[PDB]
Amino acid sequence: ANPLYQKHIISINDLSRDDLNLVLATAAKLKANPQPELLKHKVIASCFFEASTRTRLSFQTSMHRLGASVVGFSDSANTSLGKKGETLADTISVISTYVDAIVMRHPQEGAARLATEFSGNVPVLNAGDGSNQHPTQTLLDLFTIQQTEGRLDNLHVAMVGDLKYGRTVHSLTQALAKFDGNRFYFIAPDALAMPEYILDMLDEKGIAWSLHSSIEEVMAEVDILYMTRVQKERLDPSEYANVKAQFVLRASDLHNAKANMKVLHPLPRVDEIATDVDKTPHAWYFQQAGNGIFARQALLALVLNRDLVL
Amino acid sequence: ANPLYQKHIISINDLSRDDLNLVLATAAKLKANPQPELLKHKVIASCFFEASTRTRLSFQTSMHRLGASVVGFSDSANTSLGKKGETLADTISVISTYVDAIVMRHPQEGAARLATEFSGNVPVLNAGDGSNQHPTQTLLDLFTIQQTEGRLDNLHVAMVGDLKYGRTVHSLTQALAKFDGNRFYFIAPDALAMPEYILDMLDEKGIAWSLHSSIEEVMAEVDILYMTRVQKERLDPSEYANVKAQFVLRASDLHNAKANMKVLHPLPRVDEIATDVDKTPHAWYFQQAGNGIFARQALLALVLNRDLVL
Amino acid sequence: ANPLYQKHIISINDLSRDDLNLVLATAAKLKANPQPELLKHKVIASCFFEASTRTRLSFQTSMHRLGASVVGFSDSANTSLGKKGETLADTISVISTYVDAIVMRHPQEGAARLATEFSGNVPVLNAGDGSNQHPTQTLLDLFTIQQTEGRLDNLHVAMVGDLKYGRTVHSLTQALAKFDGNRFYFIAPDALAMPEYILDMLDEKGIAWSLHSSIEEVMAEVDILYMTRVQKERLDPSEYANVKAQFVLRASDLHNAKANMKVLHPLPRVDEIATDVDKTPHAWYFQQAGNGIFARQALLALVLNRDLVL
Amino acid sequence: GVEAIKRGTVIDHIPAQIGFKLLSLFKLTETDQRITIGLNLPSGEMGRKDLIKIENTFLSEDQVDQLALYAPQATVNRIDNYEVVGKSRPSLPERIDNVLVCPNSNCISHAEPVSSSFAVRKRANDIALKCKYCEKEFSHNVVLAN
Amino acid sequence: GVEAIKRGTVIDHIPAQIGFKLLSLFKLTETDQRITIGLNLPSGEMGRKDLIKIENTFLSEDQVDQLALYAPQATVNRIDNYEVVGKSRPSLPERIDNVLVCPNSNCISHAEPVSSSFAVRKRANDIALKCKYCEKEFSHNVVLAN
Ligand SMILES: [Zn+2]
Ligand SMILES: [Zn+2]
């Protein structure tokens, strides 16, 4: 029986250093040797109450590469929660009487933990809930860092962008604070700054972090530059002074970059990474996106198979 | 060759007592022993021109549990009937040159019989047509009644809600009037009353029915309480005096309930079943929804397999 | 100065048989002998926050036909209340520093009384505050009733239509319950019936009122058939069952009617008074509308001239 | 058994269940005075009463009359330095202003910065309140909301 | 005694202008039994305190845990046959369910049928409350904002 078998994947806080490491070891493995009927005969729900290209299409393709069947919806507009007016609690109650794992995206923070309370014994894997958590992103980010850096301890990681509303940077700082010696650099407009709650945690664990007005001031010292998008759809009126990005990575800026340095981005990206960065040996965001297939196949393998031998 | 092989499932009126009973015997059976490649190599269309969570997702999961492939649309908004302006008659004509059974939901009454006239030899199974018929609902309601009551003869069945626009109660009274000794109690606001056409039929067959202003006045005498939703989307302007539900089942009301009594509801439900009823041994609407999987798998088995041996 | 000099006219409930009698007497004088300069040098505000044809235009024509100047608005859309966000109280407060009298129409019951608290010494004549009161309507009705029936005491008056929301029939029932032996017939749907508070007031003066489901039932007995339009705009969506005139009156119905009887109507008329009544001796509504000039200009004169006109 | 009071007001004989409804409705607690409240007291006269003693505080003529609306059998005892100098009692007030909200949703009194006001009226079972502004009469029970 | 009960509860060292919110919150008027309330009495160190005396009634878990979060000064005394069988002051809990309302506009807890729940990290500064659902942490002052 394996430790993440039947687990709910909602927040990185409930995942340990060993649970993460079991995902990446699994990932690397299916990436070396593909299992096409590993989930032959499981049907999985794919409930997206909010927009997606990568999380849903990667999820759905990982499910197919493993032999599973997918049922779902790309918008609540057509569900009876969107037209006949039912609660999300009833939605998840009947959908868990039909399927074997629920994958869901959702605009309010907290909807993934909501689902679990009504899902009975079906695992709920959180594809993103408003600006809260994005666990499966973080697992493909960790797989991509390990792959380019051979270590997840002692990195210099710079997080550039909308860190307030960024569900992706909220999950990634919580998983990297579970490894040794990682140094953090936050570059965000201050009204879209890192939530003090992750900061207190960074402090309670004695990890070193810092703020910087610029990307030129840390370029030389970083292993990873994790760029993010200004979450327009999440901004409040007050923040409209902040829709256009403040820090824009252009290929010239990479001049004093460590040769090993990788530019990561969850994507979609708007104006903040100039397309001239795409042609450098530092841009690695599309390889990161490809790596969504092995990490989400490993997550489904482990939650739905009591023991894997591979 | 079996009697529902290649049949169209449109209205309960064309289904007999024996056709229904062949579905439930089938249902119970696949529910005891699952057939994962029974429909291996059939492709099925799933055409929803109107909102759904349960009918479409249960249908689609039953199709997958049996080995079939699904193609379709959750809204006409994207079809060429919704943007290039084609008739529903042409829609069904080309879709029947591609698939093996058409499952369709549709806002106008009568659209399912429309489809059959153009579907050639492909079976059309009606997922619901406006306020007319909902056959596959009724089959999972009958499976759930039999399962809780061991009989489909001599029940006391109370139908509470919007019986005028309720496609579900229109199909269920027509199937239960095909068994012996069932007593019926209708509790609806009168401008959303049971259509006289089902009533005349109840009379021509000499079945006993009755109207009641209250749920307390029949609670003690009923085997099933079938609660329904006020079909807002179907109400005419005149009926706007009726959007908020008149009769709301709360857990206290169940006090003098027969111990065997089950609360059924097709769902979604709005304000009419208080969530305190969900925690009683009388609420059974989510089990009813789970039972959508075995009844719609049995319906597809029989229409698409000339003989089943199981 | 005369009994209504500087006096605000907000509701019929604040005026006496004596003030009504003075206002009609003055109306009979001015109709016979115009006073072109009577308000030469006065400017009146004509403030309509709601739609109007009849009241806003006869008011601004009465002011003009006495030498007054009119400033104001027929729509709030382009006032600062309409676009910059101010309160009614600050509209009224700045507008009291410019004009000599304020005529105002509002969608909210209570708006003219609210505006007297801030008009200072300037009078506020109510052109209709929501469904509450419309006092100048009632003065041209009374002028027209006495003009036709010779009297305002011992009249049989049938008020047909929407009595709930009829700001017109609310003020007229209060105006007529002040003379003697007037008899009421009230013909409405239940949902739009006469306000309770009105009937109480009737009971205390021991006025004989009686409900009736048909014009035909009162036709031969009545003298003034005062018809009303359904206040489409004020109906609750629950009330939308009766938006079309339940009682519509065609010329046929006048068959069994009292040769002194007059059909009165505040107007707009929609479907309730069929265009053939327009040729009968009984139809008097376009005549009633024109009496708006004399009643309306007798009011202006008394509120702004100490010296009673002759 | 409740408290000795130097000077003020003791509204005694408030029906058990209304004592708290009053300390909330008319801002009595919003003071810096010592208030002693006895909820649920054996009265004999009534089975149970309620009792509020507000130290160094008097009520007014209209203030006390506002009480008729919830507590006609109350008795406002005016006390000056331990002597019951006054034995005041509630008639219906002619108008309650500022404490109630008009049940008419489309009344102006909701949207504008003005205080409410209601003419009180002894109808024929309970008491009826007519809004100043929209002029609709409502049952007093209704006014006291949901 | 400064008032008296056989069995029941007397809560003491309530901050001024908290006793009355407490009467509200724990619904202590839904009770047919005697209650004494000492509004705005003294308390030498911190001048005035309020005091509540629920006769022949005692508090359940939840209320005392709330009491910890609304009045860490108060002390609750289990009085049986007049003897103060126990006087215990509250210690904060780990989690508060079904009364605090989460500050985040976008928390699912609002729109959906779930009882709220908060984790309680006593910070050297104050009480950090973390929502069960959105995982945000707030200042207890943000949260208890009445
Ligand atoms: Zn009002
Ligand atoms: Zn929250």
Q: Do residues C240 and C191 both lie within one domain?
A: yes
One-letter amino acid for residue C259 of the chain = A
Q: Do residues C5 and C95 both lie within one domain?
A: yes
CATH of residue D38: 3.30.70.140
CA B198/CA B195 separation, integer angstroms? 6
Peptide bond just before A268 cis, omega within 30 deg: yes
Q: Do residues E82 and E21 both lie within one domain?
A: yes
* Interface touch C237/B240, C-beta < 8 Å: yes
Cβ-proximal residues to C53 (8 Å cutoff; 6+ apart), any chain: C268
CA E134/CA E109 separation, integer angstroms? 8
Residue C81: closest CA among C119, C37, C56, C47: C47
C-alpha distances out from residue C310 to C2, C32, C34, C302, Å: 11, 11, 11, 11
Chain D residue with minimum CA distance to E32 = D40
DSSP assignment letter at A66:
T
Tell me the two tokens of residue E71: 């009045």
Q: Do residues A243 and A310 both lie within one domain?
A: no
CATH of residue B157: 3.40.50.1370
| Residue B94 forms contact with C (CB below 8 Å) | no
Q: Do residues D14 and D84 both lie within one domain?
A: yes
Tell me which method was used to determine the 3D structure: X-ray
CA B247/CA B273 separation, integer angstroms? 9
Residue A262: its H or E element: strand A262-264
Choose among E113, E130, E134: nearest Cβ to A109: E134
Q: Which of D61, D78, D93 is the last residue of a domain?
A: D93
* Interface touch B229/A94, C-beta < 8 Å: no
Q: Do residues D59 and D122 both lie within one domain?
A: no
Other Cβ atoms less than 10 A from the Cβ of B287: the count is 14
Q: Do residues C72 and C82 both lie within one domain?
A: yes
CATH of residue E129: 2.30.30.20
> Bridge-partner residues for A9, per DSSP?
A125
Other Cβ atoms less than 10 A from the Cβ of D35: the count is 23
Q: Do residues C120 and C141 both lie within one domain?
A: no
CA A142/CA C306 separation, integer angstroms? 90
Cβ-proximal residues to B262 (8 Å cutoff; 6+ apart), any chain: B144, B145, B148, B149, B223, B224, B225, B282, B284
Give the full edge-to-edge strand order of the sheet including B124-129: B69-73, B43-48, B102-106, B124-129
CA A90/CA E54 separation, integer angstroms? 42
Query: How many domains does chain E fold into?
Result: 2
Contact B162, B265 (CB under 8 A): no
C-alpha distances out from residue E123 to A145, E120, E127, Å: 35, 9, 6
Give residue C272's Cα distance to chain centre: 19
DSSP string, E105-135: TTBHHHHSS---EEEEEE-SSSEEEEESSS-
CA B112/CA B104 separation, integer angstroms? 7
Contact E84, E6 (CB under 8 A): no
D84, burial (CB in 10 Å: exposed 0-12, middle 13-18, buried 19+):
exposed
Q: Do residues A71 and A145 both lie within one domain?
A: no
CA B146/CA C158 separation, integer angstroms? 62
* Interface touch B75/A80, C-beta < 8 Å: no
Q: Do residues A165 and A269 both lie within one domain?
A: yes
Q: Do residues C170 and C223 both lie within one domain?
A: yes
Choose among A73, A84, A94: nearest Cβ to B74: A73
Q: Do residues B142 and B4 both lie within one domain?
A: no
Tell me the two tokens of residue C216: 């035909």
Give residue B99's Cα distance to chain centre: 24
C-alpha distances out from residue B210 to B173, B187, B218, B247, C255, Å: 13, 9, 10, 16, 46
Contact D86, D77 (CB under 8 A): yes
Handedness of CA A228, A52, A96, A94 (dihedral sign): positive
Q: Where are the alpha helices (DSSP H) in B103-223?
A: 111-116, 135-149, 167-176, 196-204
Contact B103, B125 (CB under 8 A): yes
How big is chain A, counted in residues?
310
- Residue ranges of the annotated binding site of D for Zn(2+) are 102, 107, 131, 134
Contact B300, B68 (CB under 8 A): yes
CA B171/CA D22 separation, integer angstroms? 57
Give residue C200's Cα distance to chain centre: 21
Q: Do residues A145 and A283 both lie within one domain?
A: yes
Give E126's contacts in chain A (Cβ within 8 Å). Answer: none
Q: Do residues A267 and A303 both lie within one domain?
A: no
Q: Do residues B113 and B159 both lie within one domain?
A: no
Q: Do residues E62 and E27 both lie within one domain?
A: yes
Give residue A125's Cα distance to chain centre: 12
Q: Do residues E63 and E122 both lie within one domain?
A: no
Domain span at residue C310 reads 1-133+292-310
* Interface touch A45/B60, C-beta < 8 Å: no
- Pairing, β D8-15 against β D75-80: antiparallel
* Interface touch A130/E134, C-beta < 8 Å: yes
Q: Do residues E57 and E103 both lie within one domain?
A: no
Q: Do residues D78 and D129 both lie within one domain?
A: no
C-alpha distances out from residue D120 to B299, C200, D68, D94, D129, Å: 69, 15, 11, 5, 5
Angle at C132 between CA C131 and CA C137, to 5 degrees: 90
Residue D69: closest CA among D46, D42, D102, D99: D99
- Residue ranges of the annotated binding site of C are 54-55, 84, 105, 134, 137, 167, 229, 267-268
Cβ-proximal residues to A310 (8 Å cutoff; 6+ apart), any chain: A26, A29, A30, A33, A35
Tell me the two tokens of residue A196: 């003090």
Residue C214: closest CA among C239, C186, C195, C193: C186
Of A8, A26, A55, A91, catalytic: A55
Domain span at residue D24 reads 1-93
Backbone angles phi, psi at A100, to 5 degrees: -100, -15
One-letter amino acid for residue B243 of the chain = V
Contact B230, B245 (CB under 8 A): yes
Residue E68: its H or E element: helix E61-70
Query: How many domains does chain C fold into?
Result: 2
| Residue C13 forms contact with D (CB below 8 Å) | yes
User: Taking the CA of residue C249 as centre, how many other CA atoms within 13 Å lie in the half-sphere pointing to its CB?
Assistant: 31
Q: Do residues D80 and D133 both lie within one domain?
A: no
Residue E136 Cα to ligand 2 midpoint, Å, equals 6
Cβ-proximal residues to B193 (8 Å cutoff; 6+ apart), any chain: B163, B164, B186
